[PDB]
Amino acid sequence: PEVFDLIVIGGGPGGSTLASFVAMRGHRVLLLEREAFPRHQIGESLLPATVHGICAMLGLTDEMKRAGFPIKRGGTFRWGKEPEPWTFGFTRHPDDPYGFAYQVERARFDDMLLRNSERKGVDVRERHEVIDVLFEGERAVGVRYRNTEGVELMAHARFIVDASGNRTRVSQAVGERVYSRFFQNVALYGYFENGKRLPAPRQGNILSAAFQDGWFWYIPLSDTLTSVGAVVSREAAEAIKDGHEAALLRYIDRCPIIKEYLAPATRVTTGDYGEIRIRKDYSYCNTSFWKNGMALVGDAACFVDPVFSSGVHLATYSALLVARAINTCLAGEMSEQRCFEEFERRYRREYGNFYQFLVAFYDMNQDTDSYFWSARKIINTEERANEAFVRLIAGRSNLDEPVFQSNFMQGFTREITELQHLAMFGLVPSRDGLAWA
Ligand SMILES: Cc1cc2nc3c(=O)[nH]c(=O)nc-3n(C[C@H](O)[C@H](O)[C@H](O)COP(=O)(O)OP(=O)(O)OC[C@H]3O[C@@H](n4cnc5c(N)ncnc54)[C@H](O)[C@@H]3O)c2cc1C
Ligand SMILES: [Cl-]
């Protein structure tokens, strides 16, 4: 049974990124991926930190350029108080640092990434499904898998990392997955050909649009292809079944901007983009991201919600953080505890930043007759007590007098909240950036 420095379970952006970064330091890594690449996965809109930070460190800048991925300068939102769409840009000027990102076909993007792993020296093996992580001495020491044929084998390493995404079958070995009560949403999504684009030089921007029952994303993948998804209540899903296509089509009709952008369009009916998928119970965090010899990265560890497109960034950032722990420990410096505690602290900080901001962002949409939006509001009480206090001591307690009248990780249990509080409170990289100094 083969011996490695690291075994990575899953070859999406989390797994391939971590594998590459440790192999780049000259270590033995195996990466097992259940599927044969290329394969469809949701998660198409990217951020500059991944495009200009991660992908540059991986040495993929040039290959990204040549791919023909639409260039994402920011996004447009129909969201909040006003009906008119507003826009954001990553930077004030088009070409200054971290100025843009891409809208990617994940099949091609992940494949591109996994191929780069190989070339970086990673032993990647497709059609290989991990079944169990193996423990000895209270430490993760290997995995059981099935290879390309039905054959059950084993492999061993000093470190085992679950990068196997939301359907991980091994994460419970590290911690308990705890679902957010706030982001209790289901996404229903398909692909459309020949749909319209945003104006100006913004054709490649993501568009997200709120309507009465939730919100839509609208991501251009090429001149002809658009990813389109409705994010609605979990409760609505339990009645979209036996009628996937009809549910989405009816949702499209009920969102003006999406209705108009898809009027010229035909839905893809064949291939990987001809299906309409559902994702449910996607918002969660684990009670722990590492134990002893094992770590969780990407969707295996935690996920917030698709608005503002943070998933691939989180996966790739956590991959870098784990890579640094592994590259620093395999060099006999520091300790496993110091390095993996730093990993979890940093990861929870970035996850927490997005969680907090997205709760407030959901809260800012005004739609007073929407059940969906009314149930996705910041739960205050203490601010309302404060406001009443302040009204009183300003001389304004009389609300009938016209002369005078002219929290944290919401939706989570205490355990997640406390872990997040410690990490956020409400080490520096080596010159290489591949380990800790
Ligand atoms: C509705 C929806 C919309 C989203 N939109 C965006 C977006 O616009 N932008 C963005 O950045 N993110 C988006 N995300 C999130 C994004 O999908 C994920 O965050 C991202 O794919 C995480 O990558 P990963 O490497 O951790 O996992 P994955 O991409 O899921 O890859 C894990 C890999 O592990 C493999 N695997 C599974 N089990 C095993 C096993 N037993 N053994 C071996 N291999 C296994 C799988 O085949 C897969 O290839 C969205 C998510 C949802 C739910
Ligand atoms: Cl996301």
Side-chain angles (χ1 to χ4, degrees), residues 9 34 41 129-131 162-172 177 179 278-282 284 297-301:
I9 317 175
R34 173 187 50 97
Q41 174 54 326
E129 178 176 21
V130 175
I131 306 297
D162 186 11
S164 65
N166 76 279
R167 301 281 281 174
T168 168
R169 62 198 285 164
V170 301
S171 70
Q172 75 284 349
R177 171 189 287 192
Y179 298 90
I278 194 169
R279 282 287 302 283
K280 172 166 54 73
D281 295 316
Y282 57 66
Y284 52 75
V297 300
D299 279 10

Side-chain angles (χ1 to χ4, degrees), residues 79-80 182 358-368 370-380 407 410-411:
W79 200 291
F182 192 84
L358 294 199
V359 171
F361 194 71
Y362 268 78
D363 179 274
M364 81 126 73
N365 194 62
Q366 180 204 80
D367 197 340
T368 58
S370 177
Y371 164 56
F372 179 99
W373 299 101
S374 71
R376 287 150 184 80
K377 291 296 156 272
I378 282 168
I379 283 162
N380 41 181
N407 187 227
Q410 191 178 307

Side-chain angles (χ1 to χ4, degrees), residues 43 45 303-312 314 358:
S45 202
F303 182 68
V304 190
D305 188 81
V307 61
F308 285 108
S309 298
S310 69
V312 170
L314 283 177
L358 294 199

Side-chain angles (χ1 to χ4, degrees), residues 229-294:
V231 175
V232 299
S233 85
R234 195 187 194 276
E235 293 65 58
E238 309 173 46
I240 76 134
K241 237 300 172 195
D242 273 321
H244 264 211
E245 180 177 6
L248 183 62
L249 256 22
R250 186 47 186 249
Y251 282 136
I252 288 163
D253 287 359
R254 292 177 59 201
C255 182
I257 183 154
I258 303 305
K259 183 163 167 50
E260 78 148 285
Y261 276 49
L262 294 177
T266 176
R267 219 197 94 239
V268 186
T269 47
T270 68
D272 271 317
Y273 302 101
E275 230 71 62
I276 114 156
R277 330 286 220 280
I278 194 169
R279 282 287 302 283
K280 172 166 54 73
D281 295 316
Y282 57 66
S283 190
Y284 52 75
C285 189
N286 271 263
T287 51
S288 187
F289 298 157
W290 74 285
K291 60 163 319 199
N292 260 350
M294 191 175 168

Side-chain angles (χ1 to χ4, degrees), residues 73-125:
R73 299 274 183 190
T76 308
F77 281 94
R78 144 79 281 278
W79 200 291
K81 218 183 59 55
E82 206 197 339
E84 284 182 18
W86 56 271
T87 302
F88 71 89
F90 293 124
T91 51
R92 282 71 217 91
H93 298 266
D95 281 303
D96 65 297
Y98 304 92
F100 70 95
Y102 297 112
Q103 312 282 26
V104 309
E105 277 165 274
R106 208 67 155 11
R108 313 178 49 209
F109 181 73
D110 293 1
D111 189 46
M112 171 171 156
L113 290 174
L114 197 58
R115 267 58 279 187
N116 185 54
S117 282
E118 292 169 336
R119 302 194 302 259
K120 286 294 177 190
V122 176
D123 193 338
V124 346
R125 280 138 81 158

